[PDB]
Amino acid sequence: SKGEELFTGVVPILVELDGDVNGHKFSVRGEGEGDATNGKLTLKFICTTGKLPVPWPTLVTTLVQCFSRYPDHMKRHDFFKSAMPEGYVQERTISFKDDGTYKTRAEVKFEGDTLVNRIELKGIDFKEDGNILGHKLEYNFNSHYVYITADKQKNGIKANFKIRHNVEDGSVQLADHYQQNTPIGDGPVLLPDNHYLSTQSVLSKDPNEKRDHMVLLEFVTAAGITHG
Q: Which residues contact 224 (CB under 8 A, 6 or more apart)?
A: 194, 195, 196
> Is the CB of residue 160 less than 8 Å from the CB of residue 185?
no
Total H helices, total E strands in the chain: 2, 11
Q: Where are the beta strands (DSSP E) in 54-170?
A: 88-96, 101-111, 114-124, 145-148, 157-166
Single-letter code of the amino acid located at 103: K
Closest among 35, 51, 42 to 221, alpha carbons compared: 35
Report how far apart, in Å, the C-alpha atoms of 129 and of each of 16, 47, 95 are: 28, 22, 17
Dihedral sign from CA coordinates of 222, 219, 7, 187: positive
Reported structure resolution in angstroms: 1.5
Contact 28, 46 (CB under 8 A): yes
For 136, the enclosing helix (H) or strand (E) is none
Query: What residue ranges define each of the domains in the chain, with the CATH number in brackets?
Result: 1-228 (2.40.155.10)
Written as one letter, the residue type at 159 is: A
Q: 24-35 and 10-21: which strand pairing?
A: antiparallel
Q: For residue 88, which of 184, 7, 160, 2 has the smallest C-alpha distance?
A: 184
